[model samples]
Target: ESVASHFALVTAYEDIKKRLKDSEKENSLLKKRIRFLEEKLIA
Candidate 1:
């Protein structure tokens, strides 16, 4: 039971880490686009 539970926990942790990395990339691009839009509006 303990081994199975440990494996599941590890899998979940890895999945969350992958999702976070993907989100970070998306956020970085989103921020750049937002900045560009703001500049367009300002000028």
Candidate 2:
């Protein structure tokens, strides 16, 4: 099989990462930790 499809998938993920980072301006794991702690503190 060819590899062009893999790069396209990578591009899609890259865009998703960019959008998420722009929303949180940060990383994926950290957002979860932040929310988890935030709920813990509130709950």
Candidate 3:
């Protein structure tokens, strides 16, 4: 039980980390673009 539970926890965390890495790439790029565009419009 302990081994299986630990395996599940490890794999779950691995998958989440992989997904968030790519998701955050877009999140960061969009944030950067939005910041520049908003600044250009206002300034």
Candidate 3 collision pairs: none
Model 1 lDDT per residue over 1-43, tens place: 4599899999999999999999999999999999999999988
User: How accurate locally is residue 12 in candidate 2, as Cα lDDT from 0 to 100?
Assistant: 100
How does each model score on lDDT?
A: 0.97, 0.88, 0.95
Candidate 2 lDDT by residue in tens digits, 1-43: 9999999999999999889877775566688899999999997
Please provide TM-scores, in order, for all candidate models, with all chains considered together: 0.85, 0.52, 0.62
Q: For candidate 2, give the lDDT of residue 19.
A: 93
Q: Which stretches of candidate 3 lie over 4 Å from their true place?
A: none
Measured with C-alpha atoms, the lDDT of residue 37 in candidate 3 is 98
Q: Taking the candidates one at a time, how many backbone clashes does each contain?
A: 0, 0, 0
After superposition of all CA atoms, the RMSD between model 3 and the true structure is 2.0
